[PDB]
Amino acid sequence: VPKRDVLPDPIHNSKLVTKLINKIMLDGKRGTAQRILYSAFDLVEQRSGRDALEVFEEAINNIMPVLEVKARRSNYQVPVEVRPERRTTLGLRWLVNYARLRGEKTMEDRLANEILDAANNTGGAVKKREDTHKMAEANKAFAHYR
Amino acid sequence: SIKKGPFVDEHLMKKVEAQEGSEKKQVIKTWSRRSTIFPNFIGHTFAVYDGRKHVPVYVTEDMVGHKLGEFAPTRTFKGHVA
Amino acid sequence: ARIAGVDIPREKRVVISLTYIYGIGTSTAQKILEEANVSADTRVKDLTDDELGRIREVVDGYKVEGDLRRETNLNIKRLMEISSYRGIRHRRGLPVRGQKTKNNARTRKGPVKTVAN
Amino acid sequence: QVEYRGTGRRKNSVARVRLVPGEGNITVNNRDVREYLPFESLILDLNQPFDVTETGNYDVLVNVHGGGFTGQAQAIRHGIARALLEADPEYRGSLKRAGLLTRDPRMKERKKPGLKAARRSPQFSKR
Amino acid sequence: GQKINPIGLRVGIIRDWEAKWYAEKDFASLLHEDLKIRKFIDNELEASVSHVEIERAANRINIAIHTGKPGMVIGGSEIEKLRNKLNALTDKKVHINVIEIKKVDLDARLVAENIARQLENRASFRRVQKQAITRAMKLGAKGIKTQVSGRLGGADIARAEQYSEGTVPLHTLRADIDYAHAEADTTYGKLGVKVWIYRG
Amino acid sequence: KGDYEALRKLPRDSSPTRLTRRCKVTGRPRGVLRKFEMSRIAFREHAHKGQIPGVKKSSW
Amino acid sequence: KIRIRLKAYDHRVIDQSAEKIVETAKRSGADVSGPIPLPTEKSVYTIIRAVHKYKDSREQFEQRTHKRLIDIVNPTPKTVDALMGLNLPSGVDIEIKL
RNA sequence: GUUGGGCACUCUAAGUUGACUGCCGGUGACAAACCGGAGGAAGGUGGGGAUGACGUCAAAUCAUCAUGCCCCUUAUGAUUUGGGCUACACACGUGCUACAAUGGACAAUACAAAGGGCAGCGAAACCGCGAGGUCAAGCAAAUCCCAUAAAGUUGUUCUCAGUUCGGAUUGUAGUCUGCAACUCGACUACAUGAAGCUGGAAUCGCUAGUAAUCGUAGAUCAGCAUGCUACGGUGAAUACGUUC
RNA sequence: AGGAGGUAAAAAUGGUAAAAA
Ligand SMILES: [Mg+2]
Ligand SMILES: [Mg+2]
Ligand SMILES: [Mg+2]
Ligand SMILES: [Mg+2]
Ligand SMILES: [Mg+2]
Ligand SMILES: [Mg+2]
Ligand SMILES: [Mg+2]
């Protein structure tokens, strides 16, 4: 049961900017979802003085994990390696879900601070990646052999 | 609500003006609860059909535009325990 | 500033801050701001004293909140002394308009009194 | 004066295509496509046939009715694809790989009785 | 229980409607006084009638009676007196035709009523079906099913016995399958019979 | 009381908003469609015999 | 001109009634417009298939109406009573709007 | 597209062509069949529907109808008027509207499918702040009417506040259907401004034009739809492996 | 192929009595 296809965006010609529009898309409305992502890049370029895609490719890799637990059977967590497409699944989902919990008063402003924070290797969506390695390296001992 | 003249039932209004000739006696029986109380209705004490029986009702000068039936309650509620 | 015997929030716009007076809503605020020829987008902080008296003059034509308390409550207190249908519903503390009282009368009923048998 | 036509259907919307040589600017329902479509992302996939065949010097004039702006624009690329095959039969192979020639058969499903939608069930109770 | 009428599914595929008329207005009233024509015929007629098919035009109604013994409906004095009663009821003109049927036991309308009148004679219910199973298969039925349900022997509780011989495909929709349910009114209550006959 | 209910419906009432409608075959007050003037139970057995003109089962 | 609308419940009893009327127009020469089909008017009835309980079990019934429009121009003395004379099969009505 | 012309395009609805594991490769007991590939609008019973084997639950209905037996028959049958089926300390099931900034308000502007209409559908104009009122064009329907589709898009504005969020509750003044809205209708206008800051233990639906969301239509019906039945717009995320 | 020794702790209860060759 495969995933079909997604075509790129006109502006950046990339496969995972348009895949981020689907995660911000709430209620099936696409037009509001495009304005939140196309205008937050303009806010990032004001702060960083860099290309918007250049800060984006850096901040995506700082969120994407490499090895995660899985519950199976008392309570046992087994660390396995992550496929190269669940990495982008777990990566930018943490980018949007932890950006709604920022505290600023505009999601246009909340999305542009997380890509600013996560490029500097700090933040709420980055400490989730720290606590999915730390949780998976305490119990790396027992579970790999079995 | 109705912009037409407040609702007259032909039998009820007939015997209210058949009371203002000599004396205002105290009991007339009526089954009309849908009749708007006219300004002529005052001073006469009616007997509406609550359901079980006709109950007494007096009309003061603060009942114009109100129905005849709303002063008689049809269903009775006592307390759930007291 | 203060108008018609009530204090007014100062930072907000005039057509919103006039709706803080009991008796004036969003339509009867603009129906003063359209005849007195005051710009509706002004802040209450930024009026002068000439436009304040011009608005205050025509407001007393409409009923003040001190009038509306004894005007509304006298419409209820005459319903109880004539023993109407909704006069006694005001006494019981139950919904007037004929709502079903099986499940939800909670605005008039209030907090809940949970028992079962 | 040679003019290639195609018809394109998607999702209760049909298209009628007249293309003239000229500058590559789309025309639809005697207006311009800037106001006709809210999102420029739709313009990228209706200019997808000109990308894959590599050519251009074609001015397209479209007439559509029915449907909403996604189906009424993603049917235009169906008409562009079936008219560029009237210009050159060799262009078919580049259009075949992306799938621009085929028609989507996905249309709206039927509201079944007992269910609130096609595949939506009422909430279940004490089991 | 959990099966539909096989005649009712196939109406519009390989069965024809019993009524054939268009009515833009008065479709309610022109139907329910047409429902009294066929009720009037089935009570008076004992001629074993299958079809009371109706065609209507302006000022006329065509009555194409399909029956087992055609001489009972034809009679002269029998048919026109029925026509005299039909003209008096609707206050419109009727025109009756009588069509016979050969192979009487190859029609499920008439196997169902023959079994139901013999059950009022209180004959054994297992053998009234078994003669009906044998008689159709010699006359040329590829399949036949018969069911009698109710208080069969006079028992205090009800059951249902059924019989078959041959193929009767009920899920095949292009199969032409006749079907009828008739009633027997016993002193022990009612009694439902059901006959499927598949001829090909 | 099904006899007097179908009998009280046939004469015209004093007030023309008292006029209910019933089935013509069974005399049922609810679930009756006014184009055919028969209830939802009497409409199903007539369609399954083939007596109402131009009516089948829809399977779109 | 002469406008003839056919309306029936079947796509087969009206398909022959359109062709059988149009030869009789051709017997008086020519100039009869071909049968052009009009969109059908179909109606859906949704009844409960149970008697007492079971609201969730329904059954969907259908009534269709099929249409054909035939135009005839240049009327001749022979052509009027000829098409009036023949009797169509039952279930279809003529709406002649001259 | 309104009138001269044109049936090219679309559309309408009748008839036909088409998809079959029918070709190519490999594995296979040379068999069944599976994994691919070509062509092709569509590929592996294309998507969805209709269709429910013998039987199980003394499952539901005697109030659709029909009926064995039992009871009533100066009433358990019949008539009218008023009342109740709408009560209210509470407990449960199913939904609707919310708690806001992916938002609220004010302007301009964009694109549907389906279905209904004879004393029924009410165009335009004028009148009213609005619900509506007067006068009535056309129309038994690919023609006229219900009928501006809404979310959307472009603009101004509000600034994290139980508020310019929410719209319950109550007062006054109305409109309409009807013999008549007190018990006990729908809607409008003004004033009023309740709980509510994402919901404990537990629990539900859903694999693609689906979930979520946004309007529209019908039956019943004088008048009354958060219900039911249908229709289209925008439109995801995920399936590693199991079935412990 | 054959022999031998063992299982990721847990988890109660539910009157009586009949149908039908
Ligand atoms: Mg249930
Ligand atoms: Mg009524
Ligand atoms: Mg039982
Ligand atoms: Mg009564
Ligand atoms: Mg608001
Ligand atoms: Mg808040
Ligand atoms: Mg046990």
CA distance F21 to A134: 76
> How distant is C1' of H62 from CA of G57, in Å?
23
Amino acid type, D27? T
Amino acid type, G75? P
Ligand 5 centroid vs D68 CA: distance in angstroms?
A: 30
G39: which DSSP letter? Answer: P
A105 with A96: CB under 8 angstroms?
no
The secondary structure of chain C in percent helix, strand, coil, rounded to multiples of 5, reads: 50, 5, 50
Backbone angles phi, psi at B41, to 5 degrees: -80, -15
CA distance C84 to C81: 8
Cβ contacts of D40 on chain A, cutoff 8 Å: 10
Ligand 3 centroid vs E157 CA: distance in angstroms?
A: 14
Antiparallel, parallel or unpaired: β E60-67 and E93-100: parallel
Nearest CA in chain F to G50: F41
> Which residues on neighbouring strands pair with residue E67, listed in sequence order?
E49, E100
Residue D77: name the closest of D34, D4, D26 by CA.
D26
| F48/E5 Cβ within 8 A | yes
Out of E74, E102, E130, pick the residue that ends a domain. Answer: E102
Q: Which residue has the tokens 């055609």?
A: E70
> Which residues on neighbouring strands pair with residue B47, listed in sequence order?
B29, B56
A82 with A67: CB under 8 angstroms?
yes
CA distance C13 to E29: 69
CA distance G34 to G75: 16
E110 plus E95 within the same structural domain:
no
Q: Which of G59, G90, G93 to mutate to test the interface with F (most CBs of F within 10 A)?
A: G59
Residue D67: name the closest of D10, D22, D125 by CA.
D10
Antiparallel, parallel or unpaired: β E189-198 and E177-186: antiparallel
Q: H or E element: which one contains E53?
A: strand E49-57
Q: H or E element: which one contains A31?
A: helix A31-48
Is D35 buried (19+), middle (13-18) or exposed (0-12) by CB count in 10 A? exposed
Q: H or E element: which one contains E95?
A: strand E93-100
Give the side-chain half-sphere CA count within 13 A for E76: 0
Q: What token pair was written down for B35?
A: 């009749």
Provide the domain limits for residue E31.
Answer: 16-102
Cβ contacts of E20 on chain F, cutoff 8 Å: 53
> Which residues on neighbouring strands pair with residue E96, listed in sequence order?
E63
E143 plus E90 within the same structural domain:
no
Residues in contact with B38: Cβ distance below 8 Å, sequence separation at least 6, in sequence order: B6, B8, B13, B16, B64
CA distance F11 to E44: 30
CA distance C48 to C46: 7
> How distant is C1' of H210 from CA of B11, in Å?
66
Q: What burial letters (b/e) apply to C1-19, b meaning 16+ CB within 10 Å? A: eebbeeeeeeeeebbebbb
Residue A133: name the closest of A72, A60, A66 by CA.
A66
CA distance B5 to B3: 6
Helices and strands (H, E) in chain C, number of each type: 6, 0
Is residue G50 within 8 angstroms of chain F, CB to CB? no
Q: Residue A7: left (phi > 0), alpha (psi -120 to 50), or beta?
A: beta
The secondary structure of chain E in percent helix, strand, coil, rounded to multiples of 5, reads: 35, 30, 35
> Would the CA dihedral through A111, A113, A114, A118 be positive or negative?
positive
Residues in contact with E31: Cβ distance below 8 Å, sequence separation at least 6, in sequence order: E19, E23, F36, F37, F52
Antiparallel, parallel or unpaired: β A80-81 and B28-29: unpaired
Q: Is E174 helix (H, G, I), strand (E, B) or coil?
A: coil
Q: What token pair was written down for A119?
A: 């490029």
* C31 CA: nearest nucleotide by C1': H129
CA distance E106 to E94: 30
CA distance G87 to G25: 15
Q: Is G58 helix (H, G, I), strand (E, B) or coil?
A: strand
- The DSSP secondary structure of E185-197, one letter per residue, reads EETTEEEEEEEEE
CA distance A20 to A60: 11
G5: which DSSP letter? Answer: E
Q: Which residue has the tokens 């304005």?
A: A35
> Which residues on neighbouring strands pair with residue E100, listed in sequence order?
E67
CA distance F36 to E30: 10
CA distance D60 to D19: 4
Cβ contacts of E21 on chain F, cutoff 8 Å: 53
Q: Is A134 helix (H, G, I), strand (E, B) or coil?
A: helix
Backbone angles phi, psi at A63, to 5 degrees: -100, -35
Q: Which residue has the tokens 């039936």?
A: B69
Distance from chain centroid for Cα E139: 19
Antiparallel, parallel or unpaired: β E60-67 and E49-57: antiparallel
Residues in contact with D29: Cβ distance below 8 Å, sequence separation at least 6, in sequence order: D36, D62, D63, D64
Ligand 2 centroid vs E31 CA: distance in angstroms?
A: 24
CA distance D98 to D100: 6
Is E43 buried (19+), middle (13-18) or exposed (0-12) by CB count in 10 A? exposed
Residue D18: name the closest of D64, D70, D68 by CA.
D64
Residue D14: name the closest of D74, D59, D85 by CA.
D74
- The DSSP secondary structure of B24-68, one letter per residue, reads --S-EE---SS-B--GGGTT--EEEE-SSSEEEE---TT-SSSBS
Out of E80, E102, E124, pick the residue that ends a domain. Answer: E102
Q: What is the largest CA-CA distance in chain A?
A: 52
Residue E46: name the closest of E30, E67, E23 by CA.
E67
Q: Which residue has the tokens 């009702």?
A: B57
CA distance D45 to D26: 13
Backbone angles phi, psi at D108, to 5 degrees: -70, 135
CA distance B67 to B46: 13
Amino acid type, C25? G
Do C and B touch, counting CB pairs below 8 Å (3 needed)?
A: yes
E75 plus E109 within the same structural domain:
no
Do G and D touch, counting CB pairs below 8 Å (3 needed)?
A: yes
Strands of the sheet containing G58-63, edge to edge, are F56-57, G58-63, G43-48
CA distance C45 to C11: 6
D82 with D1: CB under 8 angstroms?
no
CA distance F58 to F50: 15
> How distant is C1' of I11 from CA of D122, in Å?
34
Please, which positions of strand I sit below 7 A from a protein CB? 8, 19-20
Ligand 2 centroid vs F17 CA: distance in angstroms?
A: 7
> How distant is C1' of H181 from CA of C59, in Å?
38
Residues in contact with A18: Cβ distance below 8 Å, sequence separation at least 6, in sequence order: A6, A7, A8, A9, D41
> Which residues on neighbouring strands pair with residue E52, listed in sequence order?
E65
Q: Å from C99 to nearest chain B CA? A: 15
E34 plus E82 within the same structural domain:
yes
A25 with A107: CB under 8 angstroms?
no
Out of E78, E102, E126, pick the residue that ends a domain. Answer: E102
CA distance B21 to C40: 64
Q: H or E element: which one contains A55?
A: helix A52-63
E95 plus E109 within the same structural domain:
no
Residues in contact with C40: Cβ distance below 8 Å, sequence separation at least 6, in sequence order: C13, C14, C15, C30, C33
C46: which DSSP letter? Answer: G
| F47/E7 Cβ within 8 A | no
| F56/E28 Cβ within 8 A | no
Number of domains chain E contains: 2
E147 plus E92 within the same structural domain:
no
Residue F20 CB: number of other CB atoms within 10 A? 10
E141 with E197: CB under 8 angstroms?
yes
Q: What token pair was written down for E134?
A: 């044998």
Q: Which residue has the tokens 């370029």?
A: A45
Q: Is D20 helix (H, G, I), strand (E, B) or coil?
A: strand
Chains in touch with A (≥3 Cβ pairs < 8 A): D
Helical axes A31-48 vs A107-119, angle rounded to 10°: 50
CA distance E54 to A115: 80
CA distance A143 to A67: 13
Q: Å from F22 to nearest chain G CA? A: 17
Map out the domains of chain B as residue ranges: 6-77
Q: Which residue has the tokens 């008329």?
A: E21
E10 falls within a domain: no
Cβ contacts of F53 on chain E, cutoff 8 Å: 17, 19-22
- The DSSP secondary structure of A78-131, one letter per residue, reads --EEPPTTHHHHHHHHHHHHTTTTS--S-HHHHHHHHHHHHHTT-SHHHHHHHH
CA distance C14 to C51: 11
Q: Is E66 helix (H, G, I), strand (E, B) or coil?
A: strand
Residue E162: name the closest of E199, E124, E195 by CA.
E195
Q: Is E13 helix (H, G, I), strand (E, B) or coil?
A: coil
Write the secondary structure of D51-117 as one string of H (helix), E (strand) and C (coil): HHCCCCCCEEEEEEECCCCCCCCCCHHHHHHHHHHHHCHHHHHHHHHHCCCCCCCCCCCCCCCCCCC
E36 plus E76 within the same structural domain:
yes
| F56/G49 Cβ within 8 A | no
Resolution for this experimental structure (Å): 3.2
CA distance D39 to A14: 17
> Would the CA dihedral through E183, E184, E185, E188 be positive or negative?
negative
Residue D113: name the closest of G63, G47, E171 by CA.
G47
Please, which positions of strand H sit below 7 A from a protein CB? 9-15, 39-42, 46-55, 58-61, 64-69, 77-95, 101-103, 110-113, 115-116, 140-142, 149-154, 158-160, 164, 168-172, 174-186, 189-194, 203-213, 219-222, 228-240, 244
**What distances in angstroms separate CA E157 from CA A9, E153, E188, E189, one per listed residue?**
75, 10, 11, 12
Residues in contact with A29: Cβ distance below 8 Å, sequence separation at least 6, in sequence order: none
E188 falls within a domain: yes
Nearest CA in chain F to E15: F50
Antiparallel, parallel or unpaired: β F38-39 and F56-57: unpaired
| E55/G90 Cβ within 8 A | yes
End-to-end Cα, chain A, rounded Å = 29
E44 falls within a domain: yes
Q: Which residue has the tokens 């390696």?
A: A81
Q: Which residue has the tokens 């479709």?
A: E27
Q: Which residue has the tokens 């027997």?
A: E184
Q: What token pair was written down for E175?
A: 């199969």
Nearest CA in chain E to G13: E20
Q: Is F57 helix (H, G, I), strand (E, B) or coil?
A: strand
| G60/F59 Cβ within 8 A | yes
Is G55 buried (19+), middle (13-18) or exposed (0-12) by CB count in 10 A? exposed
CA distance G70 to C104: 64
Residue E49 CB: number of other CB atoms within 10 A? 23
End-to-end Cα, chain B, rounded Å = 38
Residues in contact with E61: Cβ distance below 8 Å, sequence separation at least 6, in sequence order: E34, E37, E54, E55, E90, E92, E93, E94, E95
Residue C63 CB: number of other CB atoms within 10 A? 14
Is residue G53 within 8 angstroms of chain D, CB to CB? no
Q: What token pair was written down for E118?
A: 């013999």
**What distances in angstroms separate CA E14 from CA E177, E178, E194, F10, one per listed residue?**
10, 11, 21, 41
C43: which DSSP letter? Answer: B
Q: What token pair was written down for D6?
A: 């195609």
Q: What token pair was written down for A24?
A: 């911000």
Is E182 buried (19+), middle (13-18) or exposed (0-12) by CB count in 10 A? buried
